[PDB]
Design a protein around this ligand. Sequence first.
Ligand code: MET
Length: 531
Amino acid sequence: VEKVFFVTSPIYYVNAAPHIGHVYSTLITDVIGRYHRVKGERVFALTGTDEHGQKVAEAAKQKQVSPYDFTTAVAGEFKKCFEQMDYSIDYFIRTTNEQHKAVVKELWTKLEQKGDIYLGRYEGWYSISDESFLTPQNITDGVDKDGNPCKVSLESGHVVTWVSEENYMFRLSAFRERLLEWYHANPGCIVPEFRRREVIRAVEKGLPDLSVSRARATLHNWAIPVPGNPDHCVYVWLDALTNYLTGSRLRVDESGKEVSLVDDFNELERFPADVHVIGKDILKFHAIYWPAFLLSAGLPLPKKIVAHGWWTKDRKKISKSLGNVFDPVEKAEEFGYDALKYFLLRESGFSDDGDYSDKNMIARLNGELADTLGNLVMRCTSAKINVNGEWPSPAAYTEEDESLIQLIKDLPGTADHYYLIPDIQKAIIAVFDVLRAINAYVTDMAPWKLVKTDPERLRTVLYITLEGVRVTTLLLSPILPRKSVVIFDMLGVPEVHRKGIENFEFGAVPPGTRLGPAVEGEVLFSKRSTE
Ligand code: MET
């Protein structure tokens, strides 16, 4: 099917200011979107904020201010942060949006009409901080803010509380068999593979029904009322997950402001998501609850859920209270935006919990960005080596030349598959494997010596080098968006050849193309003092 490629991040609780976790989730979403735009596809990338619920409402009361004023303020901080991070998100959704609210009521009514919502009770544990229902197998003993003994989530360590309430219940138990069919029939639907196995095991063990409303008082009336029953509010998670459907149905103007909500998602050709980017903490909501609601409502299921891991700094938990911070905008101003994005995407795979340190960040910046990529770009554009400031016409290729050309020809296919898993780390590693091979080749051929000794041979070496850089840069462009433009400028690559699968082919830029102009002190990535 030809269709708008639809990629999403979670929508983030606005109980607190934005931080690395949010920036990372949205980065992954942004990169996936950027790559598909580079392939020439229509892309709609979504992010935003989750603004209802007890968690948020009680965060606002702690700051002694109105929930409307509080959410709007913090939502503005999330936007400012994402603007500063230089993402290419198509829309920023807020669950306070009135059009979103209409979609929630619409979905709720669909589930009710389908017979999958009934009036029951939940008597059990709840984590307000995770807005999550827990069974007694998932709590243990712990300590609250005071120091008193209490119960806490095994999953997250936050304080749990006992809830006994007459609630509207969704028949999640009735979807066990169909969810299992879905997971089996689509073995690529959850990534990485071990989290897919985690989900299957959980659903195999059995599913209870899920409380999809709460009494209005306990949410401090900060939620969407249940259609036909003003005494109840919709479960913040059913509300939240619906953002993906809302987003798929919003027409957005040039400025990024929402202007219209269509009736039928087919109208905008986005739904269902091709990739839901999420953190491991919220897997069950997306891989169990979400598809169950969609199945009930007769809506199509997402194609892929990708769940990444948690971050630490110097092998310690990131926390303002513990005295170990990681401000992304600060580190970006220190080391560069593209470089910081490279590091976060390179350093950790989705299977792992990543670890920043200034030491490791400087090693990759110097080692990979400067010594490997940057050094190569300067060499093939140098007036000392490339004396006519153009793309030369290659002479006959040696077997060594062709071994390199082969790697470059194969790179797009390989990087493509990795981006579609998606596994951004492996894609980056693949591109840099080819970059290391180009450097070895250049070291081997010594083009600086060829300038005087064998100009005809230099044409070949120089042409292959320029073309390897172009291709490696194109495939890295979703990761180093600003620097890829500088590189393409330096190579003098026309705009048209900077996107499209056509330009994945070796030899897309013709000989005689003139390099862009030099600058007296310019350099792509500057080496940082080794500390
Ligand atoms: C449907 S994505 C909701 C994510 C949730 N607000 C969180 O921050 O974990």
